[PDB]
């Protein structure tokens, strides 16, 4: 999962 | 006459100061939930605030376990009417 | 749980439930999740009869909740003069410090509760008590534009  | 800033809906993926999450394999928590909700609820005649509430609910249930992270979308609106997206 | 029921009854100002609950052995010093006792709750919500009943039933007049607050702090803050008096009459520490080192006098002063300030002073409130920010009740009354109150404190 990645963050914007 | 209605206010200049009436009839806005701002669907923020996250409250201020915080990350919103993007799964490279699935898209973002927020947008995916939103679309899911829209697709599921618009035909039911659910209005966007109800949908965004569901989005809030859905996204709120997601976890970035690594960072014990959550994401709290936050709609803001000056909608004066129910916003529905009918057929 | 009788304590919880008593907490809510006290909180809710349900005198008869309180009396009934404590006739039924309810822990007069039950603490909710915030360390509030029925006395805190009653003090906070201005339920004098309940405060009286709780105190008569051995309520810890100096119960400190999780935030370091006493029923007196609450009574003073929220301007429940009679409750302040009853608390004080029942041995409330007039100078109990909360976590900011505010005494009830600080709070009463902060909220311009002149009669409570008077009662507190009359009950030995340390007028020079400085909170953890070095502020006296007087300083707090000034910061909060309670001049009529500042006058009293200032002269102390």
């Amino acid at each position: 999962i990645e963050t914007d | 006459y209605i206010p200049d800033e009436a009839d806005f809906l701002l669907g923020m993926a996250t409250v201020n100061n915080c990350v919103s999450y993007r799964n490279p394999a699935e898209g973002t928590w927020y947008i995916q939930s939103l679309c899911q909700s829209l697709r599921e609820r618009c035909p039911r005649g659910d209005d966007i605030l109800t949908i965004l509430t569901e989005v809030n609910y859905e996204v709120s249930n997601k976890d970035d376990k690594k960072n014990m992270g959550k994401q709290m979308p936050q709609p803001t609106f000056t909608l004066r009417k129910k916003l529905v997206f009918p057929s | 749980d009788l304590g919880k029921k008593l907490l809510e009854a006290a909180r809710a100002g349900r005198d008869d439930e309180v009396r009934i609950l404590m006739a039924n052995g309810a822990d007069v010093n039950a603490e909710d999740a915030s360390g509030w006792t029925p006395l805190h709750l009653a003090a906070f919500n201005g339920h004098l009869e309940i405060v009286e009943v709780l105190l008569k039933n051995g309520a810890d007049v100096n119960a400190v909740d999780h935030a370091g607050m006493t029923p007196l702090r609450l009574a003073a803050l929220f301007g429940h003069l009679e409750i302040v008096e009853v608390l004080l009459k029942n041995g409330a520490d007039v100078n109990a410090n909360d976590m900011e080192g505010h005494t009830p006098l600080h709070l009463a002063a902060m909220f311009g509760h002149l009669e409570i300030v008077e009662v507190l002073l009359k009950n030995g409130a340390d007028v020079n008590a400085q909170d953890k920010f070095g502020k006296t009740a007087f300083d707090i009354s000034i910061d909060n534009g309670n001049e009529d109150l500042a006058e009293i404190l200032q002269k102390l």
Partner: protein, 150 residues
């Protein structure tokens, strides 16, 4: 009963999708964004938005990898054009962001308010009285929203 926005025009209106994936420019051009990552997966959002809003009879208007200036220019067109025959305007911004802003792929900042304010009744009278919807998929900072038990 609340009034309901008219939502019957075909198309309902434009659903602008600013889909920012490539932040190479940001990484090159904005020191504090030197390590800002490309937004892999954003295409899936764009697709989801596209199919969802097509279903809702919006004309989807995707724009990929918009620098802030490009965003403003694109938005300007939508701000300026005549939506009289539209019942709604939707703008989705998929990008990085920070408090109150979204990033162009160039790492420039576009305050969300700056974006949404382009569609006020004054800015865009043909949308006056019509829902203007902005979905902003961006971070609004780098804090992790903490979770609390319920």
């Amino acid at each position: 009963l609340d009034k309901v926005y008219q939502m019957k025009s075909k198309p309902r209106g434009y659903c602008l999708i600013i889909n920012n994936h490539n932040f190479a420019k940001a990484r090159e051009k904005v020191p504090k964004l030197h390590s800002i990552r490309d937004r892999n997966g954003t295409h899936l959002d764009a697709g989801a938005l596209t199919t969802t809003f097509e279903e809702l009879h919006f004309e989807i208007k995707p724009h990929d990898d918009c620098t802030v200036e490009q965003i403003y220019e694109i938005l300007k067109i939508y701000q300026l054009m005549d939506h009289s025959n539209m019942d709604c305007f939707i703008c989705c911004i998929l990008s990085h962001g920070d408090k109150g802003i979204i990033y162009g792929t160039d790492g420039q900042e576009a305050p969300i308010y700056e974006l949404t304010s382009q569609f006020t009744g004054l800015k865009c009278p043909s949308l006056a009285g019509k829902p203007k919807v902005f979905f902003i998929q961006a971070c609004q900072g780098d804090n992790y929203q903490k979770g609390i038990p319920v």
